[PDB]
Amino acid sequence: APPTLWSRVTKFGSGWGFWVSPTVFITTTHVVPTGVKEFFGEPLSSIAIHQAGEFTQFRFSKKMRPDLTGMVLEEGCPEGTVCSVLIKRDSGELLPLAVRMGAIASMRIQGRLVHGQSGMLLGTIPGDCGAPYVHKRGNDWVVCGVHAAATKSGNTVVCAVQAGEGETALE
């Protein structure tokens, strides 16, 4: 993972967010500041906000990170593949966690049913919410979720995904 990729990982509210491009920022809904009128110094009327369950996307009118190129945002992580949760700790330490992704479905997070995807850690803390789930496709990195939750057991984590509707079916 290149430094640029990590530079997209940004402290935000009670957790983290991720610059997908110069104008697009994704994060986990429950970490988003609630009493505010600006994000990153931009008034809400300047920002297109799409929230689906625990997945929140901001598109700013202004180029917030013109140093960045856009990258692909997938609708969920590829089931069965190893992704990395790009965790930054408060000391500055980089803690990428490898995770084997499982099924996409509805899960109860923060007392609400939301589209999510479980994964097995190959640990995280509450402050890690918003950290991106990414994987490499070709020579490029792709982002597919943002950290939402974990079992007390610790071994399983859940990311919120942009669109999970009907990804797994009863047989």
Indicate which residues carry an active-site annotation: 30, 54, 129
121 Cβ neighbours under 8 A, 6+ residues apart: 97, 98, 99, 154, 155, 156, 157
Handedness of CA 165, 5, 60, 132 (dihedral sign): positive
Segment 54-73, which members bind a copy of itself (CB under 8 A)? 64-65, 67-68
Query: How do 72-73 and 140-150 pair as beta strands?
Result: parallel
Rounded Cα distance, 143 and 90, in Å? 22
3: contact with a copy of itself by CB under 8 A:
yes
4: contact with a copy of itself by CB under 8 A:
yes
* Least distance between a copy of itself and beta carbon 44 (Å): 19
Rounded Cα distance, 9 and 87, in Å? 8
Residues touching a copy of itself, count (CB under 8 A): 20
DSSP code at position 31: G
38: contact with a copy of itself by CB under 8 A:
no
Stretch that binds a copy of itself, among 2-10, 53-61, 100-108, 112-120 (CB under 8 A): 2-10
Segment 85-124, which members bind a copy of itself (CB under 8 A)? 91-95
Rounded Cα distance, 78 and 33, in Å? 30
* Least distance between a copy of itself and beta carbon 155 (Å): 21
* Least distance between a copy of itself and beta carbon 5 (Å): 8
Closer Cβ to a copy of itself, 64 or 148, answer by number: 64
Rounded Cα distance, 19 and 69, in Å? 10
Closer Cβ to a copy of itself, 10 or 156, answer by number: 10
Bridge partners (DSSP) listed for residue 98: 84
* Least distance between a copy of itself and beta carbon 143 (Å): 15
Return residues touching a copy of itself (CB under 8 A).
1-10, 19, 64-65, 67-68, 91-95
